[PDB]
Amino acid sequence: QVQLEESGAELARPGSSVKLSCKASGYTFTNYWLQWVKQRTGQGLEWIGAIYPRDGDAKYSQKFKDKASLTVNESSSTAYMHLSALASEDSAVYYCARANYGLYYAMDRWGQGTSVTVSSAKTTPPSVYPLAPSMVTLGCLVKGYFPEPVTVTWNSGSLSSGVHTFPAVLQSDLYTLSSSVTVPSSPWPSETVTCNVAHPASSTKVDKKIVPRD
Amino acid sequence: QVQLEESGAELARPGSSVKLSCKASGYTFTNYWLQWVKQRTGQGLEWIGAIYPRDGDAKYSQKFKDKASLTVNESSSTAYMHLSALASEDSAVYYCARANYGLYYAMDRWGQGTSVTVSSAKTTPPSVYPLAPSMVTLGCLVKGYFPEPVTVTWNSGSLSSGVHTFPAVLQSDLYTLSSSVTVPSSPWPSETVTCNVAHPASSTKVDKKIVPR
Amino acid sequence: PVGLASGQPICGNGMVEQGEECDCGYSDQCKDECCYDANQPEGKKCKLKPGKQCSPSQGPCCTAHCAFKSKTEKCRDDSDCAKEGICNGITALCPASDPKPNFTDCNRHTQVCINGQCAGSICEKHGLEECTCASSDGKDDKELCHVCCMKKMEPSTCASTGSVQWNKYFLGRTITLQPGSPCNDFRGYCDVFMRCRGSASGL
Amino acid sequence: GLASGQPICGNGMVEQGEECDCGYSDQCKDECCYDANQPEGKKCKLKPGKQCSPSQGPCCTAHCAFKSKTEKCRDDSDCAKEGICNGITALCPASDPKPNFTDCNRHTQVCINGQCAGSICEKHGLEECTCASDDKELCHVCCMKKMEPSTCASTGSVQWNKYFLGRTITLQPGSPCNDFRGYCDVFMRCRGSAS
Amino acid sequence: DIFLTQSPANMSVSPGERVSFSCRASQNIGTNIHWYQQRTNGSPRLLIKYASESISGIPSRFSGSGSGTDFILSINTVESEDIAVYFCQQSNRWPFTFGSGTKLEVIRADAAPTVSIFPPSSEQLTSGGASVVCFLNNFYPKDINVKWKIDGSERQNGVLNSWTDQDSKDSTYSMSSTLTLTKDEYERHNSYTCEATHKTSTSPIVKSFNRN
Amino acid sequence: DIFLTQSPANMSVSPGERVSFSCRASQNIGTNIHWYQQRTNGSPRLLIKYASESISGIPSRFSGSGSGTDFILSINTVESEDIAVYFCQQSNRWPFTFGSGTKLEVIRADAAPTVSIFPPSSEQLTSGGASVVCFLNNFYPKDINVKWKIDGSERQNGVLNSWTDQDSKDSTYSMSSTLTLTKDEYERHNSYTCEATHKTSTSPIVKSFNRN
Ligand SMILES: *[C@@H]1O[C@H](CO)[C@@H](O)[C@H](O)[C@H]1NC(C)=O
Ligand SMILES: *[C@@H]1O[C@H](CO)[C@@H](O)[C@H](O)[C@H]1NC(C)=O
Ligand SMILES: *[C@@H]1O[C@H](CO)[C@@H](O)[C@H](O)[C@H]1NC(C)=O
Ligand SMILES: *[C@@H]1O[C@H](CO)[C@@H](O)[C@H](O)[C@H]1NC(C)=O
Ligand SMILES: [Mg+2]
Ligand SMILES: [Mg+2]
């Protein structure tokens, strides 16, 4: 199955550079143009450029010519995009996508995106708090962390339905996020519901069991 | 097996009379003295008298001679005590008991007792109210009824352990009683506990499901 | 006195026994000023303190103060057939009571005092003899447990004390036997309720 | 969406046997014209005193007058000039040709009699060839001295500097390349072909 | 009649220990006396007859002796189901007479009352009266106090108290206390509180609510 | 470059109805244009190429037509997993360009928010700050307001709001609001209230607590 697996989220200081990767499998890497596309939160797609992995020939949007450098390792069937001299306007999600159906190519297969964040702000772990009051709603507060993402599961992924995790909100170089789970009043308190937060950038992991308050 | 089954609780007006009965089975009725004993709440035993069911010969305590009358039906193997000219001092539990191990007899077998109440007060049904607040205690209030007894069970008697039913308290011709069950917080609310109250004298029955406030 | 007796004489039970003058018990029990406690040496164990005339543990005719009670002081209550015990003034024993006169009422009126005892019947009081009332036939009377009298060696005349005959002597009052007394010609015993309970043959 | 096309009175398109077509009655905003829900032979004909209808063409005004003679009814083509009204009709008359050897089709060809033809080579008196095996140059427009195929080179070459000044002209996507073995894609790579 | 005394009136003993009840006759009855056990809400049950002799189906840990005027019933190893009142009765003459009984308590570790308060029910409030119920549950030893406070103030009127006998599994005691008001007089006030005072604390156990 | 606009920006339709998204190119691109779907947190997904032509594994309810400068992507008929943003992209010349997208809402029956308020946790209070969070969960339609009140007084500072996209199973919207304080200023006051205003009531939903 045809797949483009991209490198994971980068944090990067202004003026530095990042090297984003896209590893191709499932097809012949050197038979297809491979393209890069930028998307700022939540906003349009913007075509950066394309490379032809056979000879490494590259086309660039004029806008990105001073920003991006495209290369491939043909052995590893991997493509790279270097973003350099980083400013905040470069914080964005970046897709690789395979070009297909010539002569005017659609982009028929996409990577998951890599999220680049460009800031001076220092990596911080979240504090995680319980949110407790026929149906009952509980939650977790994930407070004061940087950078994105965090992940939140409930009971190690045994609760899925019932769950809203809210989009993180930035104030003063920290994110806050909350998660919300609604379960029947019969299991809770009687059976345990736990939120599991992980913040891969600090390798913090927290479990919190929710328990009834005064 | 030797057994004596007694009639159930009497309410009786001052000045009236009652007929209390004791049914013998499990032996030859007519071979044993049969005795009657009064006990006021909660207090000493008091021997009323004895009767010998063969010829119906009766012995009476002097104190009860003007009170109690002893008879038998030999056919039904039943003994009777009539209490007459009833006053409040006659309110008491009354046992029949078999005399055995001669010649100076112990009382080797007893009926359950019959509770006699002597009052002018008219029968009233209880109101039943829920009592709700790692363990949790709930209850039932059983209020403003007459006469005793009532029975209280929980979930038709599936809850037994966990349970105090308190002794009833008399104020102004009505009784109030409470009952108390303690269950883990896991069943309640999640699984239901219901008290079942019954007051035979009015043939009232109440179920009440206990529910959080 | 609850529980079995050792049935061995020992100096230290409350009782005087051969070879001992008094016995007030072991030190922990002995309120006697007259006597020497059981856990006190031999040879004094068991013996009257000197100058002390007698001990109340020997008998009621000694005072708490180790003196003989004077003669004709009460040492015993009246029995049925006997008068008060009186001290004789030379011992702490209460001497045997003297008898009440013959044909005095004894044993809940049931028999009569002869030479200080209980014997015979209240029948003999009137020059009758005690008989047993007896059954019509297999069928148990209350009168089985009555005191019943007859003219002397004339058992035909047997009747309850309260019967219409004997009215001269008893005036129609039934006198019941004592519980435990045999009844229906030794085929029975009287229970507390004065019924004759059949009893086993061949004992 | 798809065209019917059947001539009928009306679709809003003027056809044989009709002078104007404004639509049916609730479509018809034309003060010049009779709607299709009018009686036969008022159907799709000009209202009286009305010279023409904007449904006939751009050279009629909203008020049913012919536009006058030098007025613009049509845009620049590659090979053709603006359309001008003639003042006697509402049709926009055929545009006149732009000069011969004007650049058309992204500088790939030349206008001759207002069609778009040939090659930009012919402008300079060269002939078009295909470059054949540098791999990029497969999608260049390439010129040769006339009947001298050895001399074939890309418009962007050093050799053609006189005429093309070192500026490359790429072929249009879809063009045959490498002597009819291939086609150029949007990225101007020559994609191998088979049939 | 022949009269009996029992000593003592109540008696208190740890499980597995031995207990002895004493019965005194007002004249010589020989051996004719018998012993009865009455558990709570139960009938009398014959233990010993005549006064050493065993009854079929009676536990062997029950024994007796005595003669003349003085008699003793003994339990050699007490269990907690032996909580009851024990009676001597004389058969020597009729009318038969009973000693006034000795009550057996079984000792256990101290327990503080579990105290619960309950507000008037919906029904009862729609009906136009109001009862607050306080339980004080499963405590030892026996002596306790309950107090009531309405909005901080000690209310002695309308308070009906009830006490359980000793529990045969648990060995504890429980108590309810019921405060009863008109819906009106109840609805004057706000914070309703009941407090327990028991040996197992220097300070009273307080439970409360506000009307909601 | 060649530029694309998409109309309208958002569009909202009941399930099983038909919907049509529109794309305008700044010059004649012929058929060389393609259509992509992006769900929430998703990658773009190729729907149609060249602009009528189908992609293997794409649901057949997706179609497209157009030519030259004007193109239409059509869903006949809508389901609720079709919630997404839809993009046109032209391949006619590079740099390739995208329209700015149309968002699809799927209409459903009105739902009032489930409103929950939560007090600061123990951990957070020991740490020297305090957060109150209000959820407003599973409401439709989209527009809503929060107000916060402390002891009756309306508080605009320290309030952080977050909104979900539409739920693909539920078809609803949820929202969180986080009021964030010093432990000190939190411990100044007593009653904390979050109040929600939505189409489904004339009067705002109020949840509250008191500091305990
Ligand atoms: C390509 O990747 C492989 C990693 O397996 C590495 O050995 C090789 O040196 C790489 N090539 C270049 C040009 O970096
Ligand atoms: C004894 O009881 C029976 C009831 O089965 C009754 O028929 C009979 O008449 C009773 N005897 C007397 C004397 O009432
Ligand atoms: C009493 O009874 C006997 C028997 O007749 C008699 O001989 C005895 O002497 C009597 N007592 C007296 C005072 O003698
Ligand atoms: C355009 O070129 C053709 C061919 O040489 C010629 O016939 C025609 O006259 C030219 N047009 C003009 C306006 O010169
Ligand atoms: Mg001795
Ligand atoms: Mg027409």
Element layout with pairings:
The complex is a heterohexamer, with 2 copies of chain A, 2 copies of chain C and 2 copies of chain E (212 residues).
Chain A: E1 3-6, E2 10-12, E3 17-25, E4 34-39, E5 46-52, E6 57-60, E7 68-73, E8 78-84, E9 92-100, E10 106-110, E11 114-118, E12 127-131, E13 135-145, E14 151-154, E15 163-165, E16 169-171, E17 174-184, E18 194-199, E19 204-209
Parallel strand pairs in A: 2-11
Antiparallel strand pairs in A: 1-3, 3-8, 4-5, 4-9, 5-6, 7-8, 9-10, 9-11, 12-13, 13-17, 14-18, 15-17, 16-17, 18-19
Chain C: E1 74-76, E2 85-86, E3 105-106, E4 111-112, H1 122-125, E5 129-131, E6 148-150, E7 159-160, H2 167-170, E8 182-183, E9 188-190, E10 196-198
Chain E: E1 4-7, E2 10-13, E3 19-25, E4 33-38, E5 45-49, E6 53-54, E7 62-67, E8 70-75, E9 85-90, E10 97-98, E11 102-106, E12 114-118, H1 122-127, E13 129-139, E14 145-150, E15 153-154, E16 159-163, E17 173-182, H2 183-187, E18 191-197, E19 205-210
Parallel strand pairs in E: 2-11
Antiparallel strand pairs in E: 1-3, 3-8, 4-5, 4-9, 5-6, 7-8, 9-10, 9-11, 12-13, 13-17, 14-15, 14-18, 16-17, 18-19
Bound molecules: 2-acetamido-2-deoxy-beta-D-glucopyranose (4 copies) and magnesium ion (2 copies).
One 2-acetamido-2-deoxy-beta-D-glucopyranose is lined by residues 73, 75-76 of chain A.
